[PDB]
Design a protein around this ligand. Structure first.
Ligand code: NI
Length: 341
């Protein structure tokens, strides 16, 4: 049974609600992004209208085989009428194709559903500038002040400089980058660009990347692993055993691996600057954990909410414990008292 924080009151609409069977009263199912916790339940047998971005619709058709007649892609930044209700899709600054949804309810209430997002000051000059929001359904993944991490630009600068130094010292070093979902493509694209290489990967991952509308993608990626010195592997293989095994397969082309694990936050963020990050090393293999986040930090979330001044907040993450719910409610009241709304 579908939980309350996935229903949009006053509509026939749900958000990210495909694992509950046929939801009573639902006439249109929105999908914010192509991450498995959110699409859980969708397949080629789905026969209700799915509303989403173009990129998400490419993934639904090619990866999950949902039939074309049920996929309803909408352009971004554009007022659209769906089943008699005005909606807008906004870029969420999460993974490719990820949106926030603005719903203009028939009674005059305005609702923002962030989906998953990484708040940014640029969102203060979107279509959100123009009107008031009564209800905010908020991605609260990192809603606590201990969750700190650098900008995505600082993280990429560290990765590019680290990879370029290692391979210039040793032209026979291979770079490997872990993946388990869409998102965080800039990690491996920026490294391959500084090295003058295409990125090599499995046929299954190539297919996924081909759905993302990335400019000049055919110039950037390949399934011919032997021609490439940046390889993508499943995240589960990014350990000394999996990497050893991979280096065997390369036919003595390489004699060293430098590997990256983009994580979200880890507690080593509580002590260490990005600049001071060091790898784990065993022989000719080194592994870096890099804090590349596609979710808001505490400070970025607080800024966004203090700007938007919603009348009510409904969290969509960390909702399963009373302690998490109480913590999040305390910070919402601080923010409101401090800013005066
Ligand atoms: Ni996500």
């Amino acid at each position: 049974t579908c939980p309350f924080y996935k229903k949009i009151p006053g509509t026939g609409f749900t958000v990210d609600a495909f694992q509950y069977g046929v939801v009573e009263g639902c006439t249109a199912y929105f999908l914010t992004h192509f991450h498995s916790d959110h699409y859980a339940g969708l397949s080629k047998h789905f026969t209700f209208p799915v509303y989403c971005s173009e990129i998400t619709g490419n993934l639904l058709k090619n990866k999950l085989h949902v039939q074309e007649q049920y996929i309803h892609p909408l352009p971004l930044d554009t007022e659209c009428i769906v089943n008699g209700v005005k909606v807008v899709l906004l870029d969420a600054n999460h993974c490719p194709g990820a949106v926030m949804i603005l719903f203009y309810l028939p009674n005059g209430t305005v609702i923002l559903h962030t989906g998953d997002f990484r708040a940014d000051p640029s969102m203060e000059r979107s279509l959100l500038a123009d009107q008031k929001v009564h209800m905010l359904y908020l991605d609260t993944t990192y809603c606590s002040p201990e969750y700190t991490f650098p900008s995505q630009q600082e993280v990429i600068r560290f990765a590019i400089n680290t990879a370029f130094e290692a391979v210039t010292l040793n032209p026979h070093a291979l770079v490997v980058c872990g993946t388990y979902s869409i998102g965080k493509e800039k990690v491996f694209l920026a490294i391959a660009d500084v090295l003058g290489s295409k990125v090599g990967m499995s046929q299954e991952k190539y297919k996924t990347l081909q759905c993302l509308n990335i400019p000049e993608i055919n110039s950037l990626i390949t399934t011919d692993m032997c021609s490439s010195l940046v390889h993508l592997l499943p995240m589960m293989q990014i350990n000394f055993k999996g990497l050893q095994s991979h280096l065997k397969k390369c036919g003595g082309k390489y004699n060293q691996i430098l590997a990256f694990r983009p994580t979200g936050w880890t507690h080593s963020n509580k002590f260490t600057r990005i600049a001071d990050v060091i790898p784990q090393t065993k022989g000719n293999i080194s592994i870096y954990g890099i804090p590349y986040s596609e979710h808001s930090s505490y400070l970025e979330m607080k800024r966004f909410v203090q700007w938007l001044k919603p009348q009510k907040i409904i969290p969509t993450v960390n909702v399963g414990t009373w302690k998490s719910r109480s913590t999040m409610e305390k910070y919402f009241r601080e923010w409101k008292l401090e800013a005066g709304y």
